[PDB]
Design an enzyme around this catalytic site. Structure first.
Site, PDB file in Angstrom:
ATOM      1  CG  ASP A 157     -14.319   7.389  -5.422  1.00 42.39           C
ATOM      2  OD1 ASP A 157     -13.214   7.813  -4.975  1.00 42.39           O
ATOM      3  OD2 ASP A 157     -15.078   6.650  -4.401  1.00 42.39           O
TER       4      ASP A 157
ATOM      5  CG  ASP B  53      -6.874   4.952  -1.004  1.00 38.74           C
ATOM      6  OD1 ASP B  53      -8.015   4.856  -0.778  1.00 38.74           O
ATOM      7  OD2 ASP B  53      -6.485   4.550  -2.093  1.00 38.74           O
TER       8      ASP B  53
ATOM      9  CB  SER C   1     -12.478   8.615  -1.872  1.00 41.93           C
ATOM     10  OG  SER C   1     -12.058   7.392  -2.408  1.00 41.93           O
TER      11      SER C   1
ATOM     12  CG  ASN D 152     -11.071   5.545   0.308  1.00 44.56           C
ATOM     13  OD1 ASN D 152     -12.461   5.618   0.465  1.00 44.56           O
ATOM     14  ND2 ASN D 152     -10.479   5.852  -0.708  1.00 44.56           N
TER      15      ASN D 152
ATOM     16  CG  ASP E 121     -17.218  -2.754   7.056  1.00 47.24           C
ATOM     17  OD1 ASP E 121     -18.011  -2.266   7.870  1.00 47.24           O
ATOM     18  OD2 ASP E 121     -17.162  -2.868   5.899  1.00 47.24           O
TER      19      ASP E 121
ATOM     20  CD  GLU F 256      -3.087  -0.751   0.187  1.00 49.12           C
ATOM     21  OE1 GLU F 256      -2.801   0.113  -0.705  1.00 49.12           O
ATOM     22  OE2 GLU F 256      -4.002  -1.831   0.171  1.00 49.12           O
TER      23      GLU F 256
ATOM     24  CG  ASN G 293      -9.091   5.904  -4.204  1.00 49.09           C
ATOM     25  OD1 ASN G 293      -9.431   6.103  -3.319  1.00 49.09           O
ATOM     26  ND2 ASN G 293      -8.034   5.076  -4.763  1.00 49.09           N
TER      27      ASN G 293
END
Ligand SMILES: CN(C)CCN(C)C
Ligand SMILES: [Cl-]
Ligand SMILES: [Cl-]
Ligand SMILES: [Cl-]
Ligand code: NA
Length: 129
Positions: free
Chosen positions: A48, A52, A50, A59, A101, A35, A46
């Site tokens: 979209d 990270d 967003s 994110n 999650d 990462e 990203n």
């Protein structure tokens, strides 16, 4: 901060990430390697819109607030900037929520693609832990 491999393993262990949700320490080190290359200041934008943040590239769509991700949540109750600190406490605490999650470490696509099923203990081999 750019951690050393064993250095990061130690910090992760001290913060209780080791075997958390059943994921051995090498899984977490491997994920961090791919990462962020162990760099707490890593960021990635990203498609979209967003972003990270940090050593585990957490994110802003769900997990932290950056003020610039419309519709998003802040489930870790932190500014995203907290994930860039030389102190990994906020990244670890938030990673514990993420891995809990439902999808385990598959939440990190890079863990799925580059660490899952591999000899992840190699990432802590040699380390005084
Ligand atoms: C076996 N490999 C990919 C793990 C890398 N270590 C040596 C740091
Ligand atoms: Cl391991
Ligand atoms: Cl926002
Ligand atoms: Cl799991
Ligand atoms: Na957010």
């Amino acid at each position: 901060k750019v951690f050393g491999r064993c250095e990061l393993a130690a910090a992760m262990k001290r913060h209780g990430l080791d075997n958390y949700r059943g994921y051995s320490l090498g899984n977490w080190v491997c994920a961090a390697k791919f990462e962020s290359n162990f760099n707490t200041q890593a960021t990635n934008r990203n498609t979209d819109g967003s972003t990270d943040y940090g050593i585990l590239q957490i994110n802003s769509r769900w997990w932290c607030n950056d003020g610039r991700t419309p519709g998003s949540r802040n489930l870790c109750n932190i500014p995203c900037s907290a994930l860039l600190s030389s102190d990994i406490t906020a990244s670890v605490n938030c990673a514990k929520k993420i891995v809990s999650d439902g999808n385990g470490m598959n939440a990190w696509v890079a863990w799925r693609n580059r660490c899952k099923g591999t000899d992840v203990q190699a990432w802590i081999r040699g380390c005084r832990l």
